[PDB]
Symmetry: D2
Subunit: 307 residues, 4 copies
Amino acid sequence: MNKGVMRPGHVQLRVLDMSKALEHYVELLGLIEMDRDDQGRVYLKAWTEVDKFSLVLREADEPGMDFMGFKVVDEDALRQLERDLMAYGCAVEQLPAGELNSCGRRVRFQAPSGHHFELYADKEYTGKWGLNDVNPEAWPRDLKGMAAVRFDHALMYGDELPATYDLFTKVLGFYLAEQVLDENGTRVAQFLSLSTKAHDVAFIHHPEKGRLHHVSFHLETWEDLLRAADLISMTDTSIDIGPTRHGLTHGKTIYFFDPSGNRNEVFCGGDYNYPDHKPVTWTTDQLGKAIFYHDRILNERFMTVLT
Amino acid sequence: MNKGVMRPGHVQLRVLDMSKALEHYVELLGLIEMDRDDQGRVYLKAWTEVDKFSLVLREADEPGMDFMGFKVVDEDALRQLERDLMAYGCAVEQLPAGELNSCGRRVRFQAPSGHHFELYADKEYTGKWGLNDVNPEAWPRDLKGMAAVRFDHALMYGDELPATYDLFTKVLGFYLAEQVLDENGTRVAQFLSLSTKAHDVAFIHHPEKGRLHHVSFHLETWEDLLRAADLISMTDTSIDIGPTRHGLTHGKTIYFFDPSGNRNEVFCGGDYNYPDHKPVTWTTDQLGKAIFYHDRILNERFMTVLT
Amino acid sequence: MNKGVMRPGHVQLRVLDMSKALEHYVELLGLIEMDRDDQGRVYLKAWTEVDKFSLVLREADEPGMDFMGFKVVDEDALRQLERDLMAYGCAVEQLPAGELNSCGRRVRFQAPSGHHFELYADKEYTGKWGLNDVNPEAWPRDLKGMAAVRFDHALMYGDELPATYDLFTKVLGFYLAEQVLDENGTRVAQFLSLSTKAHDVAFIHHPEKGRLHHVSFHLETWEDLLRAADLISMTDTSIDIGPTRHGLTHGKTIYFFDPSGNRNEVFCGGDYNYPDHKPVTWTTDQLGKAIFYHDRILNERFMTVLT
Amino acid sequence: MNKGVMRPGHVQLRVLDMSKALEHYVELLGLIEMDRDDQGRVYLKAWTEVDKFSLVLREADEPGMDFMGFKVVDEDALRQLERDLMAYGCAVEQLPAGELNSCGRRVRFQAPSGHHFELYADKEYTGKWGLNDVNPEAWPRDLKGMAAVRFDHALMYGDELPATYDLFTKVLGFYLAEQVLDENGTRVAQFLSLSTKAHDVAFIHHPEKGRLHHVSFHLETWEDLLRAADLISMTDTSIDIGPTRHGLTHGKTIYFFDPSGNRNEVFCGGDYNYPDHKPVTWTTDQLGKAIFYHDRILNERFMTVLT
Ligand SMILES: [Fe+2]
Ligand SMILES: [Fe+2]
Ligand SMILES: [Fe+2]
Ligand SMILES: [Fe+2]
């Protein structure tokens, strides 16, 4: 929030089968569908979210992430981060309003790590789902599946971490919240925050660019996580790593896959920070614990399986 | 966070007896006693907090709050903010570094409602309590009582909300998160946020200035609230409102008093928002439910007992 | 279980309006309507329950309890008890099988305190609602409201507690797990257990016989209690006493009312016991806390309101 | 409880090191050391338990279980089961009162599965740990680590399942709560209960006699299970299977090991049942889900690591 960037606003994932993806995202995750495209894309949101959509699905031949967008305070900030990116040397793409139904104009650049990110000031305000603006209840009564609270963050596997770190900190205004260093003091992973969250975006080093480790969704409680895991067994969804706690951020989490092999994370309550806190450090000799607090060892497929 | 204001950093409470008060804040709330000065004040903190203190107790002839200080992003910000206050015509007060042990210089000022607030750019960093900084544990091993996570906010009863609103949103950079208006569309209560919290400070209209409704400490889970309640009963503390939930901010709350009569609130899981979110509105005709979601009726003590 | 008595089998409550009562009992509490008598008597059950029905509603001029049934192990246990009640000198009424739809024969009797209890050896077995018999899931997918686990117990306000005590222990094989004694060591409340529960049925002294204080349903967790209370507000149900804890049993509870004025308590996690534990004792000077542990004081409706 | 058997009263385990064993059980588990006898046996208990002890460690150069005893109602039921055991054709062993400090006489036998069991009527009544008998608080103040509630049950890996089944049901008055059978309808595992618990003892088919799979302690909630997982991680205890849910019994669970290799379990909220319930069935084709509900796969250590 240092340069006007407030939060992750939307992510567009690629799926092999739309119908399968919708069963998963609307029936299991609890995501509410909102729009459809000229191009056949499907727009979805979470209920505590005020804007039109946060998740957009696109039928494609390979799964993965097309791009992640962050919403900025206003247009003044949009032009100022747009010019700074071009001034920094980043070749920017100007996306026109409407190219994504109900979304303002976007600035799409490519991170040195190979991922495409977007910045945007506008998006259609539909308000919280199933709730009134005046004298609102605690929650809408007919939410489904897990009833994801909101699109929280996403973790990426990437190639140039130093250059990506400079881009996000210097030109975009993210601050380092968590990090994992090796014996030399080299950042193997970096958790960047935009406000008080342990992280709004994160990168872990990888030989091949553009990899997506997972897209997360926020859940409220530890008993919500148990409910979610019961739902996984119930629907026979594939689970990566059950209810546990992360060494980094100390948040409770469950990893599972969608019909396309994309990994989804659902998690609740981690640690908070503020721009003035020193980054929490984890070391490479504690990589097991840093990822999996309770087992202190690494899931083979945690590092191998990407999309 | 628009003008660079991050969070409430400390609040100085007047207590009648330091001994009974200390026993309350450390054995019941589970706060950590960090220091003591030549004026006979004791400084305390919460364990998730990174700075030296958040609560400074002061033995007086009357309970109540002296001032509440918010920490800003940096020195530059502190300069800007103090200049802006003077331009607004607000009379600032300068407190040199050291008058409050381990705290830097501060810019004190009195809001129209009779309360003193102050900004400060820095304080002694001690890091999280009982926790190493590399490969940190999920929590410290020897915590007392409720083990409050952090000093969250405070609610003020005062006279001139309207002008206070401009003061806080226009010069200080806060933003209205929620509000309750009366029949004539007149804002009778305003909940101001800095970043993602439902509120970092809040004011409710009251004929006499200066009043302090309560100081709040954040707890983590609903079950943590059930434990605090057991403790309030166990240690025979005075309870104002048992495990319930507010309509405003939808957070789960418990109200109780310290040996001096100040009301402390312990709570968890409210609602989050962002600068671009439209204010949630509650009306006076739903005022009972606005405050007490479950019962939907007002409590005698709750609107009438202040310090 | 000292003389074959297993658990509270079913309860027949009088409602003033069937439709309103049904909305409360199927829509709010989540009880499944299973049958409908040829005389406008409707049968409902909780999902974890293995038999066809636990609650039976019937329109009458006033609210209250007609009878409370307990299920015994087998027909033989039903005979010896039948013999024992009669030999004990008790007026026994025998209802033929089928008088209550899908229910076996019953032996009813009115206890000294003025209430009607009845034993029965069998009832149509249905298995858990919405679950397979082989490789069952953790829970059925389409539960409404609070989704109560099971009819748990009921609190009777009566006049002859000693006589009632002898009847329930010596003849029915119950044992008191808890009690409250007054100044002159007189048992003012008795919590009678059948096996491990803190109480399966309880009696509190009241000048008038026959009064039904409340009927309880089990909810699994403290967070479910919270969800139940959120529902109550959204439903606008009359709440008696919010999320709190008792001293007796130490269970978490919420008292509310059905549309006919009958009290309904939803609770979780009391204490357990076995026939060899000495009865936990509470005293009259500590009454406030014995009932409301957190608040330590009694509330109007708690004692005033009966049905 | 058909025949007087109320619940598992105690279990004596063999530990390679007493200094270490004591740290695991008192520090990590929260058990209270209550005694130590001549042969260096040390007695311990869980706080909600009413009798002197439940766990008794013995230093021996081989880990494992020596015997598991059950407390029966009275001396009468003991002479009765003892008679029935001799009549059944069993070789009984009469332990004199005092063999185990503060414990009465005991009848011990070897079940066809090779496991030794005991029956006893008397043990020094001590009451809940650290709680006055009149007007008890909800919980003691100084409970360490996991603060185990009570010694719950134990799973045994034996050979003669059909023979043991008859012995327990017929002579000991236990009832088959849950079971799992193969394609040939051969009962591969039996979960037997005394009263309402999903199981007080269970046997899984194994080609070896006398093997101990795990001994269990009850923890109240899912969040308690989480705190336990943090502690295991913090104390660097060997964890077998993280916070999950079992298919059988549906209880939330965590498997881990003591300093001698004996597997310990901590869990909360299984299913409840009564003597009239049909035994829940799990078919071997779903053995994966039956054991590990969320994962639906079998972890090597689970059916391999033993005694
Ligand atoms: Fe994540
Ligand atoms: Fe507050
Ligand atoms: Fe009750
Ligand atoms: Fe077990």
